[PDB]
Amino acid sequence: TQSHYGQCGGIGYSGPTVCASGTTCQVLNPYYSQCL
């Protein structure tokens, strides 16, 4: 899973998108979504 404060869903982001249990994937910007 993605770490806390990590990107959880960018458009074209091939890395860890699934937030860790206890973190919310908050889309902050078009490509930047962060596990908060």
Ligand X SMILES: *[C@H]1O[C@H](CO)[C@@H](O)[C@H](O)[C@@H]1O[C@H]1O[C@H](CO)[C@@H](O)[C@H](O)[C@@H]1O
Interacting residues with ligand X (CB under 6 A): 2-7, 16
Choice between 1 and 30, CB closer to ligand X: 1
CA–CA gap between residue 29 and residue 22 (Å, rounded) = 21
**CB neighbours of residue 33 within 10 Å:** 22
Least separation in angstroms between residue 1's CB and ligand X is 9
Least separation in angstroms between residue 34's CB and ligand X is 8
Least separation in angstroms between residue 6's CB and ligand X is 3
Contact 19, 35 (CB under 8 A): yes
